[PDB]
Amino acid sequence: NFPRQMLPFSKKTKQWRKDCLLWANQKTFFNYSLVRKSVIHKKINY
Amino acid sequence: AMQLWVMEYEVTGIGKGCAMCKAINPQQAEMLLKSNGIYNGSSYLYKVTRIEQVIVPPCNGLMAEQVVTYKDV
Amino acid sequence: AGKLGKFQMLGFQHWAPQKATNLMVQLLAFYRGKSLDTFLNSFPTREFEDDNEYYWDVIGSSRRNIPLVEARDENGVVVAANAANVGVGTSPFYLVFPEDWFADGEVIVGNLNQVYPFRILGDARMEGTNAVYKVELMGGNTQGVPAERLQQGERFSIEFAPVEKELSRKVGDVRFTSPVSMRNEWTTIRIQHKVGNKLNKKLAMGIPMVRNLWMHYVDWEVELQFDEYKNNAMAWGTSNRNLNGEYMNFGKSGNAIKTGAGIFEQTEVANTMYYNTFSLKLLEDALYELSASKLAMDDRLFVIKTGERGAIQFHKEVLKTVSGWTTFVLDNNSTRVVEKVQSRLHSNALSAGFQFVEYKAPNGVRVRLDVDPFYDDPVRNKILHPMGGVAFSYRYDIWYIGTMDQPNIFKCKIKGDNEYRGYQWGSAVIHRMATLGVCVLDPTRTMSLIPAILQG
Amino acid sequence: LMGGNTQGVPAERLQQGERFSIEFAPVEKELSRKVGDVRFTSPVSMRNEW
Amino acid sequence: AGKLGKFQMLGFQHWKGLTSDNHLGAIFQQAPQKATNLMVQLLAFYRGKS
Amino acid sequence: TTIRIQHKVAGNKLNKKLAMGIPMVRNLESGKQVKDTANMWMHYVDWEVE
Amino acid sequence: VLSPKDIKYIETMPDYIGQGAVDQMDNIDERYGFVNQ
Amino acid sequence: VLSPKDIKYIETMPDY
């Protein structure tokens, strides 16, 4: 899960910054976007 | 997946029970209790005493009644 | 205690207006899959050069005492269990040991040390492999040693090698020892799927029991269910080798399918007990005797890892132990099972609730507790327990006994990328392959209490 | 049987009703061929009116 | 006495007193030294590549 | 004249290091065997295919 | 103008956009394998 | 910012 951002800078440790990055690896690029087209729809155009 | 079967049973030495399955025949009704019940590792303790079908046309009547007394324990 | 079924999972081979949400609902009346990723990543890793089997050094201890095989009188007749006293009046007799360990002029003692000391009068006379010392007593004892203290299975240690103060000759000798080693093995895993984005033929729908009763991403499900292949091979895997080194199972191409034991088949070679009902008479007296011989008094902290319902079985059993303590009267002043919670309904409004999460045994043994959420697995653990759960939650696992300065459990790994991927366009098959292996160095430092319904 | 069983399973452990679970799919190190598969799931809809 | 795993090769060994060369050879502490610079190539007139 | 050759190896020999008990050699084209110090196995296969 | 009560509401908001597959009690997420289309 | 172990990962990893 994406951690709490509402922290003091003492408690934004090295394992907190890794948990922010391991969360972004779990994202699978097929998520909701309000003013963009889908990646299948852009790739077909190119 | 045809008929419904209510069961009155008695786990041996542990207590008494009331169950209800959905099978085609009452031999498979004791199968779906002895393998999906809470005594999975002690399935030999299940002693099923009465199986009767859940028949519709009254649709207002008891189907199982099994009370544990202070004098049975 | 009775279950009422809240869902049913059916295969698809047995079966657009507007929406109120664009996020798919996931009910609480549905069991969910569990990763072993929180359990497996709690252990560190280790990198190897290649897929060869690997060994390391194993160091033991040194302090020995030799068991006795038989005792003989001075004419060669073996002393029986019902015989008279042996070596009366400091008369010599023989003492047959399975090894040449003691030397000339040395004083050795039986099970009763310093009460019957035996002085060895010469070198060991070999009887095949046996060593026969002609001994005599060294305590001023006139009546000799009883026949029960000269039987098979009595431990004999060395004390010293005394002489007379003048004109004496040489006595005694010295002893040496050696270490051992241990190996471990590897395992490789393979997956495939005949595939874009859409489902294939292995489908299962879930229908919930309420009252008046999309598009798949294949590139995520093949990675997830090959992650579960490497999570079940690391943790819940087994070995198929002989004591002659032969493998028992052969694959498609004639070669033997080589597997190594996972975590739970290596840590279950030692300190594993199978109980039918949990009691603190059993856990305390098994954790003390492990810690009486192996652990210092300050270093006796055991963090019990268990499931969810194994925590309430540890709660209601310490509470059985505590309620039998007739000496102490437990008040709400100190324990505070009923405290003051601020509420709108009353000025003095109260609350209730407690749980025993720790137990402290004598001689410094403290028994902690924590809940590991992978014991409550509805897919893998299918034999149910009558008090609720899946009967694997009632398994207690003690990892990390003592301190080692190196990890005892780790996951072996090849340097870099030991995972493989491959597509086979004909048929469109995505193949994936990976190797792995988990080494438990000392399985004496892992203790497990498993319920008796999960064995045999 | 896989895990070194030279005695075999008991006949009580092969009756009707016993649930089975997938663990993994091992191969050998040399000349291996394709094993295993991947499973999926499907959603069911609920409904309301005005 | 016993084994730490299914595959443990060695047992703990012990002796007393006079240590000889087989006492040191059987505890695997004696090995032949590889003569590295000594190397015998077999003498022949080779009529490959001709 | 049209000629053809073929060698087949297992897939695990990609990075297969040789713990050389005896020294691993390459056949020369002259008929001689020459001692080599390389430790990867596919260095010695691809010598012999040519 | 936002109080610390109001930042905690913006922080602890339900966000599928800002959460991961495996949740706290080790339960897997099945919607990470689905596409809306 | 790369530690030597990281250059070792960017190394031992394949170029395949």
Side-chain angles (χ1 to χ4, degrees), chain C residues 192-212:
Chain C
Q192 60 99 41
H193 178 234
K194 177 182 270 196
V195 302
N197 297 139
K198 205 37 184 169
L199 60 90
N200 259 26
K201 321 190 207 315
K202 280 192 196 329
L203 198 65
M205 313 178 79
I207 183 153
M209 269 77 83
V210 308
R211 189 190 58 218
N212 275 297

Side-chain angles (χ1 to χ4, degrees), chain C residues 1 7 14 61 129 173 234 244 260 265 274 390 393 417 419 446:
Chain C
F7 69 99
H14 306 297
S61 176
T129 321
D173 216 317
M234 272 172 164
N244 219 15
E265 296 317 282
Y274 287 93
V390 291
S393 64
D417 302 357
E419 269 207 287
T446 73

Side-chain angles (χ1 to χ4, degrees), chain C residues 46 54 56-58 182-184 266-267 404 406-410 412 438-446, chain E residues 4-5:
Chain C
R46 194 184 165 84
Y54 47 92
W56 63 98
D57 183 13
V58 178
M182 182 188 171
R183 314 173 61 90
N184 204 0
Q266 287 181 69
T267 71
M404 187 146 186
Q406 325 90 50
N408 187 35
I409 313 168
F410 51 89
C412 315
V438 170
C439 199
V440 173
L441 302 184
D442 297 345
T444 69
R445 311 179 78 117
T446 73
Chain E
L4 195 68

Side-chain angles (χ1 to χ4, degrees), chain C residues 53 101-102 116 122 135 149 162 164 176 179 203 205 209 215 230 239 253 255 315-316 335 345 382 386 390 409 421 447:
Chain C
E53 279 170 314
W101 192 251
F102 321 123
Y116 308 104
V135 311
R149 301 292 95 189
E164 58 267 45
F176 316 98
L203 198 65
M205 313 178 79
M209 269 77 83
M215 178 160 274
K230 311 193 298 179
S239 52
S253 50
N255 278 308
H315 163 66
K316 293 187 300 180
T335 81
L345 304 182
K382 310 160 283 276
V390 291
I409 313 168
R421 60 105 191 164
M447 186 173 178

Side-chain angles (χ1 to χ4, degrees), chain A residues 3 8 16 22 27 31 34-35:
Chain A
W16 178 86
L22 270 74
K27 287 303 171 185
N31 216 9
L34 286 165
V35 289

Side-chain angles (χ1 to χ4, degrees), chain G:
Chain G
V1 204
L2 289 165
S3 44
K5 174 194 197 41
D6 287 320
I7 306 287
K8 281 173 213 169
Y9 181 74
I10 302 174
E11 177 60 38
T12 62
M13 63 186 284
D15 261 3
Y16 187 50
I17 197 65
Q19 269 160 36
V22 186
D23 268 18
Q24 184 140 320
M25 199 132 296
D26 208 351
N27 266 13
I28 209 162
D29 185 279
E30 300 277 351
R31 326 184 281 277
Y32 266 83
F34 276 86
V35 183
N36 175 245
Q37 205 208 14

Side-chain angles (χ1 to χ4, degrees), chain F:
Chain F
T1 76
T2 84
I3 61 162
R4 200 166 173 187
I5 210 170
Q6 166 260 352
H7 187 254
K8 174 166 200 182
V9 75
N12 72 311
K13 313 295 203 304
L14 201 150
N15 260 266
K16 176 75 63 169
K17 78 176 295 292
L18 295 171
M20 316 143 272
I22 50 167
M24 183 43 104
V25 302
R26 299 171 309 161
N27 315 10
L28 283 176
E29 68 272 12
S30 182
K32 200 192 296 179
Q33 276 177 30
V34 58
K35 186 197 290 183
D36 196 8
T37 186
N39 66 330
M40 290 298 161
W41 170 239
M42 211 48 61
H43 158 83
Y44 296 94
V45 176
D46 302 338
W47 169 259
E48 304 277 327
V49 185
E50 322 301 326

